[PDB]
Amino acid sequence: AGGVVPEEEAAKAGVSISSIEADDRVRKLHLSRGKMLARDRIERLIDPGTRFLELSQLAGWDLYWDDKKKEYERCYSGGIVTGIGLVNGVRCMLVANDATVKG
Amino acid sequence: YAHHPIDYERSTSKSPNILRLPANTSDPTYQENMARMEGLVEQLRARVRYVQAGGVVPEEEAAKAGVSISSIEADDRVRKLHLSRGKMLARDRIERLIDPGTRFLELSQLAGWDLYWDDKKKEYERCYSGGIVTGIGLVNGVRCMLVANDATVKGGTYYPITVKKHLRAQKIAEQNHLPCIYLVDSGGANLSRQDDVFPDEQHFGRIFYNEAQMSIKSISQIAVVMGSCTAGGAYVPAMADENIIVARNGTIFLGGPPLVLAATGEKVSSEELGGADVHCRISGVGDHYATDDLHALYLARRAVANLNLKEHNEARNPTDVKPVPPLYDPRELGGFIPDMLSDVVKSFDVRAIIARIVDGSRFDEFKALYGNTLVCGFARIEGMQVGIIANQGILYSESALKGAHFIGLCTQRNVPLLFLQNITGFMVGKKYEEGGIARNGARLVMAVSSAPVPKVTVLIGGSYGAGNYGMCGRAFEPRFLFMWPNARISVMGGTQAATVLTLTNRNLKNASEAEIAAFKDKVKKKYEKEGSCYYSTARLWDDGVIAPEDTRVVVAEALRATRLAP
Amino acid sequence: LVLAATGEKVSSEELGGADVHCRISGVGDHYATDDLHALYLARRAVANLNL
Amino acid sequence: RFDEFKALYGNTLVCGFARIEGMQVGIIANQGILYSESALKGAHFIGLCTQ
Amino acid sequence: VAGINTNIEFLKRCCETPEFARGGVTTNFISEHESQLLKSPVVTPEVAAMAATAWLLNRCDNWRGAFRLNSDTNATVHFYIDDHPVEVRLHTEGANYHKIFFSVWDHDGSFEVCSGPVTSKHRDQKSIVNDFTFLFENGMHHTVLAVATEGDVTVIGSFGLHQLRLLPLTDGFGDSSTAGGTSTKIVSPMPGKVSKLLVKSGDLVEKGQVLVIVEAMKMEHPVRALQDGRVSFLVKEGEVVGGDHVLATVAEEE
Numbered sequence A: 001a002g003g004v005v006p007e008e009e010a011a012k013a014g015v016s017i018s019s020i021e022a023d024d025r026v027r028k029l030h031l032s033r034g035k036m037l038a039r040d041r042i043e044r045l046i047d048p049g050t051r052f053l054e055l056s057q058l059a060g061w062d063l064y065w066d067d068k069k070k071e072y073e074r075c076y077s078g079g080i081v082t083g084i085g086l087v088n089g090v091r092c093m094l095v096a097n098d099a100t101v102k103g
Numbered sequence B: 001y002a003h004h005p006i007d008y009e010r011s012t013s014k015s016p017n018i019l020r021l022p023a024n025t026s027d028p029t030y031q032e033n034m035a036r037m038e039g040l041v042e043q044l045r046a047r048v049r050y051v052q053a054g055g056v057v058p059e060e061e062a063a064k065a066g067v068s069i070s071s072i073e074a075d076d077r078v079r080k081l082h083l084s085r086g087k088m089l090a091r092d093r094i095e096r097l098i099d100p101g102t103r104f105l106e107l108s109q110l111a112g113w114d115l116y117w118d119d120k121k122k123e124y125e126r127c128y129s130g131g132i133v134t135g136i137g138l139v140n141g142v143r144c145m146l147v148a149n150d151a152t153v154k155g156g157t158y159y160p161i162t163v164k165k166h167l168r169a170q171k172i173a174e175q176n177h178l179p180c181i182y183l184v185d186s187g188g189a190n191l192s193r194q195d196d197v198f199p200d201e202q203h204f205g206r207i208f209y210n211e212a213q214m215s216i217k218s219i220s221q222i223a224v225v226m227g228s229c230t231a232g233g234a235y236v237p238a239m240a241d242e243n244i245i246v247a248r249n250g251t252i253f254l255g256g257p258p259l260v261l262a263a264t265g266e267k268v269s270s271e272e273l274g275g276a277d278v279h280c281r282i283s284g285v286g287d288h289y290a291t292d293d294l295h296a297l298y299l300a301r302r303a304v305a306n307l308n309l310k311e312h313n314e315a316r317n318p319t320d321v322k323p324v325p326p327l328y329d330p331r332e333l334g335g336f337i338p339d340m341l342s343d344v345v346k347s348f349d350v351r352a353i354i355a356r357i358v359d360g361s362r363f364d365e366f367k368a369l370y371g372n373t374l375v376c377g378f379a380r381i382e383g384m385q386v387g388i389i390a391n392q393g394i395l396y397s398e399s400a401l402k403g404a405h406f407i408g409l410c411t412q413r414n415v416p417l418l419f420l421q422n423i424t425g426f427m428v429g430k431k432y433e434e435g436g437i438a439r440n441g442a443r444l445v446m447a448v449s450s451a452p453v454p455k456v457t458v459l460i461g462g463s464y465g466a467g468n469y470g471m472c473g474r475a476f477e478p479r480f481l482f483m484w485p486n487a488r489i490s491v492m493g494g495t496q497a498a499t500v501l502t503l504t505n506r507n508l509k510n511a512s513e514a515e516i517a518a519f520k521d522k523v524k525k526k527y528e529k530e531g532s533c534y535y536s537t538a539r540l541w542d543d544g545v546i547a548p549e550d551t552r553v554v555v556a557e558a559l560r561a562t563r564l565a566p
Numbered sequence C: 001l002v003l004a005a006t007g008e009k010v011s012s013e014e015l016g017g018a019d020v021h022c023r024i025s026g027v028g029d030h031y032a033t034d035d036l037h038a039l040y041l042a043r044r045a046v047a048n049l050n051l
Numbered sequence D: 001r002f003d004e005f006k007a008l009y010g011n012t013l014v015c016g017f018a019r020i021e022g023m024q025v026g027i028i029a030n031q032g033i034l035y036s037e038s039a040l041k042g043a044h045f046i047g048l049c050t051q
Numbered sequence E: 001v002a003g004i005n006t007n008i009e010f011l012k013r014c015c016e017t018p019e020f021a022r023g024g025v026t027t028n029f030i031s032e033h034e035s036q037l038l039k040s041p042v043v044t045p046e047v048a049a050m051a052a053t054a055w056l057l058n059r060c061d062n063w064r065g066a067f068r069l070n071s072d073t074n075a076t077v078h079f080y081i082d083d084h085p086v087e088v089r090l091h092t093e094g095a096n097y098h099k100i101f102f103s104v105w106d107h108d109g110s111f112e113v114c115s116g117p118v119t120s121k122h123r124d125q126k127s128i129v130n131d132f133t134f135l136f137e138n139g140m141h142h143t144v145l146a147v148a149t150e151g152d153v154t155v156i157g158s159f160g161l162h163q164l165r166l167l168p169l170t171d172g173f174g175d176s177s178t179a180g181g182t183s184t185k186i187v188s189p190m191p192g193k194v195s196k197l198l199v200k201s202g203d204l205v206e207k208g209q210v211l212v213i214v215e216a217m218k219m220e221h222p223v224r225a226l227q228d229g230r231v232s233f234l235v236k237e238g239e240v241v242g243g244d245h246v247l248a249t250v251a252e253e254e
């Protein structure tokens, strides 16, 4: 749920404060289109009661330094989410392209 | 949007889109079709009975079969004389040989139906069968090919239809690695059509070729010698892992009892000339010497037992399975089939047939909006995943592309294929020809022939012309073929050939009515004189003939037959 | 891209998007009306692999 | 139990199948003075067993 | 009894509150006290917790062997109680399948649950009948024999019997087309010669019947359109039509 943390108490993470409203606006606009903006496609796809791995996570954490000195590119993930999934009794690799196209 | 399941429910429910819900309403149209079908099966199901116990039908009410009246008394006399000898004149050897409670197929039946025309104009040669009976049999937990030589020697032992049946059985067994059992009773050779049966290729020598190529691949074969096998027929007892010679009437000869006369004619007893010689002779010929028919059959079964194939078959085909029936009644299969002899092609459907045959009445459609002519997708047939190609309409380039793509996937994942043949349906439009339709047809046929997947075809109806090359055909190695009664196999055009060949044949402009009487009616007679009943099976073209209602059982027999394969 | 090079602009559907009108193109195996339908067909295709 | 091959012929030598604690076995047991035919029968049995 | 609703609750209500223990009841005695009767216990938010849990476990390994990364599990059940959908959410904290929580109708708590032997692997119409134990944090404990199916979850215990209907979510999953279908429908090829149309104009066509049959060199080639909605004919039988003509407009019923 990158960039939308309603608790606003994420001081345990040294992550800088980001414009939550912009991300929520983008997600609302995207979900109004009729497509699920989340990793939801994955846990809908995998059989219930089964396992998952999330192979690579926190990918592209604060990687690129923007023109703004205090700002990094907001790549909450690598743009995709990857994990090993068991579908219909079959083990499979799951790669999902996130809808983050801002960068 | 207010919809958040986990795929099941949407799945694993009695409401998945995968299934099919074509429910008929039994209207006149249905009746016209359903009734005809009934009119197309009764005798099919009947002639079988007549050739069974051939020529002896005590009911004498076999008018439902168009078979001519035959001298029942002569056949009964022959059977009485033969059974007095001590050997069972019937297919009885088979159902004695196969385990009770098991299945059977009868691969080729009605073989040599009214094939040869005799000197008598109104008389045909009375070959009720091809001279043999062939079917897949399960013996002692082992699946085997059963070939039995019938005791009909009145016309002669083997014909161009008999050796072809034997060779088809041998090729099927070698492809599927099912051991063979031959029940041998012969009158020698046929010295009338000998040029047609002895020399050349694909003849009586290829039987001997196959009985050695099999033992190279270590596929053990067994033969039982119930009566004489002369004229090159004595090599099968010699070329055999196990052979059985009955104590009294089992005889094997390389030279006939008349042959010793006129060449050192010191005639002696037929026993000493090569028959069953139970006196501890020097010859170590023939493994088993059995005092009775039951004893011989029992020893055949006992030898079949010690092959170690029981474990392999039991592992490969699960013996204990739960049958899953389709959602709709299989009696309705005759209804969706249209009528016959209709000037213009009638309408037809496929969804209903597949929904009636498959397990759970379900299907897995590929692209159906595109190339709406041809149908391809996965299925389930009694616990086994299957691919079906069923044809509906006039083929396009895109239909050929879709077929090639489906066959590619099926070969990739090792999925068997089923074929349901239909019309040729190649468009002749100039734009279509300019669009490289020939290239796409080649694309399809290349994939069809190149596929190493086991392949079975069954005729739905109207398989005429070169269109079958697109789907499948006998010349493309289908490990089995079966047919429905309403089948016509003909030239590239069933109805149009009439119109086209009317124009270009030495016709004057005038006398139009007499000409169409002499041209169109004649070519119609030619192109529907062939049919399912005569031109096929009787000549071992598409050897199997079945009923439309019991198709799934037959196809399941076929698939279990093709999983012992390497 | 069509503009500035024969810029006869037409609808984004006709430019290559989901064209459910039985077009000549045999591109794309499954045409699903909803997200759940598409995910369900993906699962169904995954099923028929024999793994 | 036993599964005799040809015993009337080459009555000297004995060959056939059997069962030993759940496993199928072939036995060659010798009885008398060997002949040519006994050797032929032995060769045939060994051929089947290897096959 | 589980499986069909009964009037057993009514009879008990007829016996407790009505002061007919005195022994004087008239022929019309039932008529006046109809307001008092026809009353059943209120489904407490706890009842949903045991009922919801049983449907998962009595169907699969939900919450069994489950595992995620640096997070915690979550699984939800939707109940269609009365005419109002009900959502219940269950999740775990720690490495414990045992420690479980719940939040229904904005009420939260904790409990532990210990199941029994697994039965009815075939999960047929009868589905699975198993006993359950639930230790809620407050301190109580409960035993519940739950025969759960896709249609409903039935829980029987000291509370009584209650069947909770699961929110139905089915609607021709696949064939969900709202396309207008304005023009260019069941178009016929060049030869035309339409005849023998067997569909009435302005009648719903969801199943793919033969809307129009056109003949091209003895090619009936029925179109068999499956677009839902009534079909409106702009042609008549025996009329030769051009290639790709608008024979009919298959539009959503408006």
Ligand SMILES: O=CCCCC[C@@H]1SC[C@@H]2NC(=O)N[C@@H]21
Pocket: B394, B424, B425, B426, B427, B428, B492, B493, B494, B495, B496, B497, E189, E191, E216, E217, E219
């Ligand atoms: O719509 C008009 C085209 C008709 C095509 C008829 C096909 S083309 C090949 C095959 N041979 C015939 O006689 N008819 C069919």
